[PDB]
Write a protein that binds this ligand. Sequence first.
Ligand SMILES: *[C@@H]1O[C@H](CO)[C@@H](O)[C@H](O)[C@H]1NC(C)=O
Ligand SMILES: *[C@@H]1O[C@H](CO)[C@@H](O)[C@H](O)[C@H]1NC(C)=O
Ligand SMILES: *[C@@H]1O[C@H](CO)[C@@H](O)[C@H](O)[C@H]1NC(C)=O
Ligand SMILES: *[C@@H]1O[C@H](CO)[C@@H](O)[C@H](O)[C@H]1NC(C)=O
Ligand SMILES: *[C@@H]1O[C@H](CO)[C@@H](O)[C@H](O)[C@H]1NC(C)=O
Ligand SMILES: *[C@@H]1O[C@H](CO)[C@@H](O)[C@H](O)[C@H]1NC(C)=O
Ligand SMILES: *[C@@H]1O[C@H](CO)[C@@H](O)[C@H](O)[C@H]1NC(C)=O
Ligand SMILES: *[C@@H]1O[C@H](CO)[C@@H](O)[C@H](O)[C@H]1NC(C)=O
Ligand SMILES: *[C@@H]1O[C@H](CO)[C@@H](O)[C@H](O)[C@H]1NC(C)=O
Ligand SMILES: *[C@@H]1O[C@H](CO)[C@@H](O)[C@H](O)[C@H]1NC(C)=O
Ligand SMILES: *[C@@H]1O[C@H](CO)[C@@H](O)[C@H](O)[C@H]1NC(C)=O
Ligand SMILES: *[C@@H]1O[C@H](CO)[C@@H](O)[C@H](O)[C@H]1NC(C)=O
Ligand SMILES: *[C@@H]1O[C@H](CO)[C@@H](O)[C@H](O)[C@H]1NC(C)=O
Ligand SMILES: *[C@@H]1O[C@H](CO)[C@@H](O)[C@H](O)[C@H]1NC(C)=O
Ligand SMILES: *[C@@H]1O[C@H](CO)[C@@H](O)[C@H](O)[C@H]1NC(C)=O
Ligand SMILES: *[C@@H]1O[C@H](CO)[C@@H](O)[C@H](O)[C@H]1NC(C)=O
Ligand SMILES: *[C@@H]1O[C@H](CO)[C@@H](O)[C@H](O)[C@H]1NC(C)=O
Ligand SMILES: *[C@@H]1O[C@H](CO)[C@@H](O)[C@H](O)[C@H]1NC(C)=O
Ligand SMILES: *[C@@H]1O[C@H](CO)[C@@H](O)[C@H](O)[C@H]1NC(C)=O
Ligand SMILES: *[C@@H]1O[C@H](CO)[C@@H](O)[C@H](O)[C@H]1NC(C)=O
Lengths: 135, 135, 135, 135, 135
Amino acid sequence: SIDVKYIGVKSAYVSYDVQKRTIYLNITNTLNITNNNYYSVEVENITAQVQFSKTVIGKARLNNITIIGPLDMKQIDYTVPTVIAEEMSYMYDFCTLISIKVHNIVLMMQVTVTTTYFGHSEQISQERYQYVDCG
Amino acid sequence: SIDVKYIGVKSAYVSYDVQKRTIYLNITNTLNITNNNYYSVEVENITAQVQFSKTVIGKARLNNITIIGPLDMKQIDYTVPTVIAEEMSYMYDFCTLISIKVHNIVLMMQVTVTTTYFGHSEQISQERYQYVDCG
Amino acid sequence: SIDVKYIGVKSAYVSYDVQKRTIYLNITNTLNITNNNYYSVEVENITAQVQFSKTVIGKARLNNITIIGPLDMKQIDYTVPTVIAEEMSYMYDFCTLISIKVHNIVLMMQVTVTTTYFGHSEQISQERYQYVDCG
Amino acid sequence: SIDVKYIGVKSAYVSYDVQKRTIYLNITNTLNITNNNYYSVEVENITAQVQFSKTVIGKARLNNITIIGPLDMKQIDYTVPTVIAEEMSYMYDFCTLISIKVHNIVLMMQVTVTTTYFGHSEQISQERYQYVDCG
Amino acid sequence: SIDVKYIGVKSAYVSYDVQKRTIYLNITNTLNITNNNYYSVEVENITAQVQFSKTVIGKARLNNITIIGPLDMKQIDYTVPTVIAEEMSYMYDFCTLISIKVHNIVLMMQVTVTTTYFGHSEQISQERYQYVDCG
Ligand SMILES: *[C@@H]1O[C@H](CO)[C@@H](O)[C@H](O)[C@H]1NC(C)=O
Ligand SMILES: *[C@@H]1O[C@H](CO)[C@@H](O)[C@H](O)[C@H]1NC(C)=O
Ligand SMILES: *[C@@H]1O[C@H](CO)[C@@H](O)[C@H](O)[C@H]1NC(C)=O
Ligand SMILES: *[C@@H]1O[C@H](CO)[C@@H](O)[C@H](O)[C@H]1NC(C)=O
Ligand SMILES: *[C@@H]1O[C@H](CO)[C@@H](O)[C@H](O)[C@H]1NC(C)=O
Ligand SMILES: *[C@@H]1O[C@H](CO)[C@@H](O)[C@H](O)[C@H]1NC(C)=O
Ligand SMILES: *[C@@H]1O[C@H](CO)[C@@H](O)[C@H](O)[C@H]1NC(C)=O
Ligand SMILES: *[C@@H]1O[C@H](CO)[C@@H](O)[C@H](O)[C@H]1NC(C)=O
Ligand SMILES: *[C@@H]1O[C@H](CO)[C@@H](O)[C@H](O)[C@H]1NC(C)=O
Ligand SMILES: *[C@@H]1O[C@H](CO)[C@@H](O)[C@H](O)[C@H]1NC(C)=O
Ligand SMILES: *[C@@H]1O[C@H](CO)[C@@H](O)[C@H](O)[C@H]1NC(C)=O
Ligand SMILES: *[C@@H]1O[C@H](CO)[C@@H](O)[C@H](O)[C@H]1NC(C)=O
Ligand SMILES: *[C@@H]1O[C@H](CO)[C@@H](O)[C@H](O)[C@H]1NC(C)=O
Ligand SMILES: *[C@@H]1O[C@H](CO)[C@@H](O)[C@H](O)[C@H]1NC(C)=O
Ligand SMILES: *[C@@H]1O[C@H](CO)[C@@H](O)[C@H](O)[C@H]1NC(C)=O
Ligand SMILES: *[C@@H]1O[C@H](CO)[C@@H](O)[C@H](O)[C@H]1NC(C)=O
Ligand SMILES: *[C@@H]1O[C@H](CO)[C@@H](O)[C@H](O)[C@H]1NC(C)=O
Ligand SMILES: *[C@@H]1O[C@H](CO)[C@@H](O)[C@H](O)[C@H]1NC(C)=O
Ligand SMILES: *[C@@H]1O[C@H](CO)[C@@H](O)[C@H](O)[C@H]1NC(C)=O
Ligand SMILES: *[C@@H]1O[C@H](CO)[C@@H](O)[C@H](O)[C@H]1NC(C)=O
């Protein structure tokens, strides 16, 4: 990635910024800019490219063959019980929260068993993340 | 990715910004800009490209063959019981929340068993994320 | 992706911004701009491209063959019981919520068993996300 | 994607913005702009492209062959019971909500078993998302 | 990655910044800038590239063969019970939260069993992260 940028407030090439009651008197501004950008990116010179796979099975006996890909949960037990019993009481609850499984950003590109890959793969994530603001 | 940008407030090439009761007197501004951009991106020179796969099975005995792809949950138990019993009480609940499974952004491009890939794959995610604001 | 941009408030090439009771006196502004952009993107020079697959089965015995693709849930139990019993009480509930399964953005491009792919694949997601605002 | 943009409020090339009771005196503005854009995108030079697949079965015995594609739920149980019993009480409920399965944006392009693909595939999603606003 | 940047507040080439009630008297500013950037990135000169794999099984007996990919949870038990019993008491709860499993940013590119890869792979993540702000 030639250019990746996270800029909180302001991005600018040339900035003349006059803010909060300043006095802007005699100013002469002369700006002369020559800017040229040449992008030669990902050019590929390829005569011959071959992806080839072959499988042959002969005179074989196969019994109880198990192939299981990734990300298996099988048996998971989530027990979160809450019991509140009050005879004569004063109970004030402000900003109370219970969260079990929260997923914001899930990116999965290639999950497989057998993968043959020629090329380019790029993952870019930018965020501002604030979970809980109260009071 | 040649250019990826997250800019919170303002993005500008040339900015003359006059804000919050300033006094803007005699100003002369002369701006002379020559800007040229040449993008040569992803050009491919390819004579011959071949994707080939072959499978042959002969005189074979196959019994109990199991192939299972990824992301299997099988058996999951979610138990969240809530019991509230009050005889003579005062109960004030402000901003109370229960969430079990929350998914904002799920991107899956290639999930398979057998994959042959020639090319380019790109995933880009930008967000501002605020979950809970109260009070 | 040549240009990807998230800009919170304002995007502008040249900005003359006069805001909140400023005094804008004698100004002369002369702006001379030459801007040229040449986009050569994804041009492909390809003589011969072949995608070929062949499968042959001969004199074979196959019994109990199971192929199962991804994303299987099988057995999932969601139990969220809520019981409220009040004899003589005062109960005030403001901004109370229960959510089990919430999915905002689900993008799936290629989920398969056998995939042969020549080309270009791109996923781009931009959002502003605020879940709960109350009070 | 050459240009992807999320701009919260304002997008403009050249902006003269006079807002909130400013005094706009003698101004002379001369703007001279030459802008040219040339888009050569996705041009393909292809002599011969062949997609070919062949399957032959001979003298074979196949019994109990099961192929199941992705996204199977099978057995899912959703139990959310709510019981409210009040003898002599005061119950005030403002902004109370229960949601089990909510799906905003579901995009699925290619979900299959066997896929052969030559070309270009692009998914772009932009949104502003606010779930619950009350009070 | 030629350029990766995290800039908290302001990024600018040339900045004339006048802020918080300053007095801006006689100034003459002459700026003459010649800027040229040439990007030759990821150009590949390749005559012949071959990815080839072959598997053959003959006169073999295979029984109880198990291949299991990564990320298996099997048996996990989450027990978080909460019991509150009050006879005559005063209970004030402000900014109280319980979270079991929270996942913000999950990026997985290639998780497989057998992978052959020719190319370039890049993962870039930028964020500002504030979890809990209250009071
Ligand atoms: C500078 O500004 C003052 C105002 O205080 C003015 O009297 C004077 O003529 C100005 N000079 C020039 C060169 O603009
Ligand atoms: C502006 O810059 C260019 C460079 O391309 C130069 O030829 C020209 O003389 C400059 N003009 C002034 C007034 O400085
Ligand atoms: C690569 O491109 C050039 C022209 O840009 C061409 O002359 C040459 O024949 C190409 N390569 C092959 C292997 O054809
Ligand atoms: C295959 O496995 C099962 C249990 O998973 C077992 O009962 C069976 O006997 C096995 N096959 C052979 C041929 O032993
Ligand atoms: C500068 O502004 C002042 C106002 O205070 C004016 O009297 C003067 O003529 C101006 N000078 C020029 C060169 O514009
Ligand atoms: C503006 O810039 C160009 C560069 O292309 C130059 O030829 C020209 O002389 C400049 N004009 C002035 C007034 O500086
Ligand atoms: C590539 O393109 C050039 C012209 O741009 C052409 O002369 C050449 O024959 C092409 N390559 C092949 C292998 O045909
Ligand atoms: C295949 O597996 C089942 C249980 O999954 C088992 O009952 C059966 O005997 C197995 N096949 C053979 C030939 O053993
Ligand atoms: C500048 O503005 C003042 C107003 O205060 C005016 O008297 C003067 O003639 C102006 N000068 C020019 C050069 O416009
Ligand atoms: C404006 O810019 C062009 C560049 O194409 C230049 O030829 C011309 O002389 C400039 N004019 C002025 C008044 O600066
Ligand atoms: C590619 O395009 C050029 C013209 O742009 C043409 O002369 C050439 O024959 C093309 N390539 C093939 C293999 O035909
Ligand atoms: C195939 O599997 C079933 C159970 O899934 C089992 O009852 C049967 O015996 C198996 N086939 C053979 C030939 O063993
Ligand atoms: C500038 O505006 C003032 C008003 O205060 C006026 O008297 C003066 O003639 C104007 N000058 C020009 C050059 O427009
Ligand atoms: C405007 O720009 C063009 C560039 O195409 C230039 O030829 C012309 O002289 C310019 N005119 C002025 C008044 O600057
Ligand atoms: C096929 O599977 C069923 C159960 O799914 C089983 O009853 C049957 O015996 C199997 N076929 C053979 C030939 O064993
Ligand atoms: C500088 O500013 C003063 C204002 O205090 C003014 O009297 C003077 O003429 C200015 N000089 C120049 C060269 O602009
Ligand atoms: C501006 O810079 C250029 C360099 O390209 C130079 O040729 C020109 O003479 C400079 N002009 C001035 C006024 O310094
Ligand atoms: C590498 O590129 C040059 C031109 O940039 C070319 O002359 C040469 O033949 C290429 N290498 C091979 C092995 O073809
Ligand atoms: C590489 O590209 C050059 C032109 O840029 C071309 O002359 C040469 O034939 C290419 N390489 C091969 C192996 O064809
Ligand atoms: C295969 O494993 C199972 C238990 O997983 C076992 O009962 C069986 O006897 C094994 N197969 C053989 C041939 O021993």
